[PDB]
Amino acid sequence: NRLKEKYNKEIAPALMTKFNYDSVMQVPKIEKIVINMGVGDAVQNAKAIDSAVEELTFIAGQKPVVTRAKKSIAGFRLREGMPIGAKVTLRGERMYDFLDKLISVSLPRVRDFRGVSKKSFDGRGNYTLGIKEQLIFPEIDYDKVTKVRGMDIVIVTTANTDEEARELLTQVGMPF
Amino acid sequence: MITKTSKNAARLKRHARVRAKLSGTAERPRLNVFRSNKHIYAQIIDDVNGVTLASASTLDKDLNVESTGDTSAATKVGELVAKRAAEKGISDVVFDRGGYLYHGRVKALADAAREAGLKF
Amino acid sequence: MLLPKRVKYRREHRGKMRGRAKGGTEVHFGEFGIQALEASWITNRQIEAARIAMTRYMKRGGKVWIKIFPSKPYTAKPLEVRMGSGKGAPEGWVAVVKPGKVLFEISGVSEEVAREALRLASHKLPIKTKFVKRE
Amino acid sequence: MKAGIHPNFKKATVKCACGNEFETGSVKEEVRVEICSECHPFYTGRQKFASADGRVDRFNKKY
Amino acid sequence: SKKGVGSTKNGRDSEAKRLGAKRADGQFVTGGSILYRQRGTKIYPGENVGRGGDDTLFAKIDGTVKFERFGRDRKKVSVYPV
Amino acid sequence: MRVNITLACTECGERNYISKKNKRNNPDRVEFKKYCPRDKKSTLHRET
RNA sequence: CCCGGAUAGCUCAGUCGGUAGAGCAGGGGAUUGAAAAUCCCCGUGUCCUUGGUUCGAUUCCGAGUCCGGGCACCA
RNA sequence: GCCGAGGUGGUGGAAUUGGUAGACACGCUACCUUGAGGUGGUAGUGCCCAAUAGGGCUUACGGGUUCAAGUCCCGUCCUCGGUACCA
RNA sequence: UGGUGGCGAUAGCGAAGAGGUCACACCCGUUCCCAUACCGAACACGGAAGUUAAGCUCUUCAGCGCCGAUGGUAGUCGGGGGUUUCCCCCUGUGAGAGUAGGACGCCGCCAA
RNA sequence: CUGGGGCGGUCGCCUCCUAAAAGGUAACGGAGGCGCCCAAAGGUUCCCUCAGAAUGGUUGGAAAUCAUUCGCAGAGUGUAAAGGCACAAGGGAGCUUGACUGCGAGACCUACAAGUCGAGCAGGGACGAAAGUCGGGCUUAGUGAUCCGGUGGUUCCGCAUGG
RNA sequence: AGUCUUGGAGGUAGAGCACUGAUUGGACUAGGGGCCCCUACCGGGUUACCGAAUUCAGUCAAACUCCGAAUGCCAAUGACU
């Protein structure tokens, strides 16, 4: 709730004059936040899938979904079906509030966090977060942490170009 | 760069599935429903000749309401089109759920058509 | 041996040689070419002996531009075998050559070479030849 | 919104040890943080320590 | 003497089910008789013809038969009464 | 696997139906509702 | 149609209602100027599964797989 | 010529069932034992990189099919067992 | 202008613009019916702040796609003939390819 | 069966090519299947794209999973093949068993026996609000005569009559 | 029955290379090693040492078709013999 009033009243008028769009409809938004898990433990351990089946729900209460790989892969010793990882999709109000957890709280718990990767855009206006450790925010509760797998987060915007999604995240507060 | 299609074309893909196996013949007209975001519409169409028979809507100067998009607004026009189908008193029609579900205001139109006396 | 690497079928019917050439009816990637004047089969053996006599006379070839390729195979039986009992194993290769087909080319070397160059290859083919310039 | 699947969502009062009070809506109710971003010195422009410490030696004559 | 060769391995064939056109164009065709047999629906049923379960063509009504098109590259059986 | 299966009636006692089943998929006894001609109506049926 | 084999890792036994038994193997022990072969020790078993009689019952009936020996149907 | 079988670590040989081994024995390899031997006793031991982890490579060769192939399917090449008859 | 049909993309993409008071749309929210394997993304429910950017229509243009001649040719039904793995001549038929060109919409029905 | 028989190979079905722009046509002529399988892989209801590529990215690598465009199609079609199919026949969910009994004017095919196709009618159903569909599976294969005895139901006869 | 008449069904001969395969040549190139340089298989330079894709022209088919004749066949329709 805090970021939306910040985004609507402050961030959206700021970038509008910065690149001279002809409407509020041309002012780009950041719609959905999709989070992949993608654990290949099911070849070895089906019980290790249950870790982050339960655990990712504690991050955002929208429960992730069974993601079955749609091609049997013998080089990974994997048949088709056979669930690999989970999928946290998130769009709407809590997702900017999820971003409120990200910038303000999460990132200083990356124990050697610095100016994060600038050129990790797809040439479209979308961004991926390189995270390898899941102990980022005080829910994680180390004594109940047996699995050490991190997390992959995708930023999806309505940015028609790319280099103003560059300038979008700066006004959001993404450090670089 | 997220690109979603229009709702109308998404309606058109699921309207075209309906059009493949029921059509507006003689004395079984295609009683269609259009669902704009500020109104609602109804046409009675014979697809053999391409001739509309009767049509009314919430965008009509008579018997209007305040909401214009309520399910109760569908109850008003759901008998007036059937009153036009009582005006041209054919009263017998294969119903078209035209590109929409049989859930809400579409159901309210057809039930008001049944209660006014259209034979489904 | 200009061998095709992987063919859909080992063996084909032998075809009938009527009509003109579909394409390859005029030299354009070189300036001195050779149209055939009749129609028969041509093997990889009839291209090896062809391509060798091209560069033994020129002594420094610009390019050769071998147009045709042995697409169609052909079979025969092992010797002294009564008729029937299966089409035989594939043995060699066949380039299917209609009359008026540009066979070879000569890239940028003078006429008195080229008049003698394609001469020395015409006696390695079973087909009458003629000498065609670029137009 | 399926019931019986989503855990709850409660308005969190995120507090940092330096006094940075922050508001989200989460599962847990109270979040007490050692170092937030506003407590983190890289968000404070240049951090005080490693910006002045990252120098190479001055081919040290001093002794 | 003779070197005995065998190894046929290919000497089989099915028997063909008899496809193709059956009732000619413009023919007065009674109800319920077949028009055309096809594996894979090449010619769609149009007016007064249904698609069979074995996707052949069977006339619903009596009268004459035509073959118009479905526009781009697609055919149709049209059957009209008298 | 594949076994030929009789699907008899319940309340009447005539067979009227034979189909097949699969052993790993359906090891137990199966049931359906079909049309017995003696019962002259839709009626529950049972594998023998 | 009858009769033969379902336990310990394995090979096998075995009660008339109250429980785990050999051999080989595994693990170690001592023995021996070394070595097997012997000599001890614990090991490990829902006694095939499901219901019933009964106080519970490998025990023991109510319900069935798969390997061998035959009488004998097979258009 | 035709069929029938089979092509492997240094070597001989099983894995011939569908999921990955390249058993097991004999080499070979360092050590232990003997004054040095042979012998005997542990440890590894398919090739090649990583002193480690791991990866590549492969079961005559060549190609398919497979998520897969020592095996499934087919062509070549080698070597065995059987046949090449009647006038 | 909207809704809804038929006509082989000549209805296509592609780029260049214009338009919106209503209209149509995005757009604003889930208290409710219903919902997404997870969600108001869509589907439902309701609302009307500002929005012509998107789609929606309205225009231009031949860059691809598409349509498509005429002329001749290939092949060829029959007619004979000749050196007979093929080939020539006559009556008749006649493509594809290649172009000239056409075309970046026509015809209905109802509402305003 | 047999380009003399011998041995070797094959024997029926399904698809393609030969086949000569209808159908059919042979060769010990070219290529591969089948003696099933499925309780959902059918029935309807409603839902919605695919294959790779290109990027962006922990472990992740050529190739797991996430987005992200460009993609009428390269895939997926229980399985060979041809013919179709992106309005689903491809892909999900719910509910259910029409994998219904009695039929069927009419045809295609055919020497015969077989084999195909189906409007529609009835009784009872399933699904859906309804219209309407459903007489198994995307079509074409997945198997066979009669005689024979076994098996369950039978207003059928039963050797003087009753059984 | 034959001819003329309009109406089709059908995918060979031909032709095309848009799908399928095969295949020529140039430009271009991811990437790959190699002369190997600087040198933790790590920092990058380099060639005609190859090269997938890429597009430009180029051929080719019994089991390749966006195409597609003559005829031949089932027709209706009248006419004539």
CSV table of C-alpha atoms (C1' of nucleotides) in Angstrom, one decimal, chain G:
chain,number,residue,atom,x,y,z
G,1,C,C1',-8.6,-82.9,-12.7
G,2,C,C1',-4.9,-84.1,-8.0
G,3,C,C1',-0.1,-83.9,-5.8
G,4,G,C1',4.5,-81.3,-4.8
G,5,G,C1',8.1,-75.8,-3.1
G,6,A,C1',6.0,-69.4,-0.2
G,7,U,C1',11.1,-67.0,6.6
G,8,A,C1',16.8,-65.1,9.0
G,9,G,C1',21.1,-62.4,3.3
G,10,C,C1',20.5,-67.4,1.6
G,11,U,C1',19.6,-72.8,2.0
G,12,C,C1',16.0,-75.1,5.3
G,13,A,C1',13.3,-77.1,9.3
G,14,G,C1',9.5,-76.9,12.7
G,15,U,C1',4.6,-77.5,17.7
G,16,C,C1',-2.4,-80.7,19.8
G,17,G,C1',-4.0,-71.8,21.4
G,18,G,C1',0.5,-68.4,23.8
G,19,U,C1',8.1,-68.6,20.5
G,20,A,C1',11.6,-67.1,16.4
G,21,G,C1',15.2,-72.5,15.2
G,22,A,C1',19.8,-75.2,12.6
G,23,G,C1',23.5,-75.0,8.2
G,24,C,C1',26.2,-71.8,4.8
G,25,A,C1',27.2,-66.5,4.7
G,26,G,C1',27.8,-61.6,7.0
G,27,G,C1',30.5,-59.2,11.6
G,28,G,C1',34.3,-59.8,15.0
G,29,G,C1',37.0,-62.9,18.6
G,30,A,C1',41.1,-65.9,20.0
G,31,U,C1',44.3,-69.5,17.6
G,32,U,C1',48.5,-69.7,14.4
G,33,G,C1',56.7,-67.7,12.4
G,34,A,C1',51.6,-66.5,8.0
G,35,A,C1',47.5,-69.2,5.2
G,36,A,C1',42.9,-71.5,4.6
G,37,A,C1',40.1,-75.6,6.8
G,38,U,C1',38.4,-75.7,11.4
G,39,C,C1',36.9,-73.4,17.2
G,40,C,C1',33.1,-69.4,19.8
G,41,C,C1',30.1,-65.0,19.8
G,42,C,C1',26.1,-62.0,18.7
G,43,G,C1',23.7,-61.2,14.6
G,44,U,C1',18.9,-60.4,11.4
G,45,G,C1',12.9,-63.0,10.3
G,46,U,C1',4.5,-59.7,9.9
G,47,C,C1',7.2,-67.7,9.6
G,48,C,C1',3.1,-64.7,2.2
G,49,U,C1',-1.4,-61.7,2.2
G,50,U,C1',-6.5,-60.8,3.8
G,51,G,C1',-10.7,-61.8,6.9
G,52,G,C1',-12.8,-65.3,10.8
G,53,U,C1',-13.0,-68.8,15.3
G,54,U,C1',-10.9,-67.1,19.8
G,55,C,C1',-8.2,-64.1,25.2
G,56,G,C1',-4.5,-62.8,21.0
G,57,A,C1',-3.6,-67.1,17.9
G,58,U,C1',3.7,-69.0,11.8
G,59,U,C1',-0.1,-72.2,14.7
G,60,C,C1',-5.9,-72.0,11.6
G,61,C,C1',-10.0,-72.0,9.0
G,62,G,C1',-12.9,-68.3,5.2
G,63,A,C1',-10.0,-66.1,0.1
G,64,G,C1',-5.9,-66.5,-4.0
G,65,U,C1',-0.4,-66.5,-7.1
G,66,C,C1',3.8,-69.0,-9.2
G,67,C,C1',7.5,-73.3,-10.2
G,68,G,C1',7.3,-79.4,-10.7
G,69,G,C1',4.7,-84.6,-11.3
G,70,G,C1',0.6,-87.0,-13.8
G,71,C,C1',-4.9,-89.0,-15.1
G,72,A,C1',-7.4,-86.7,-19.0
G,73,C,C1',-10.6,-83.0,-22.2
G,74,C,C1',-8.5,-79.8,-27.1
G,75,A,C1',-13.7,-78.0,-32.2
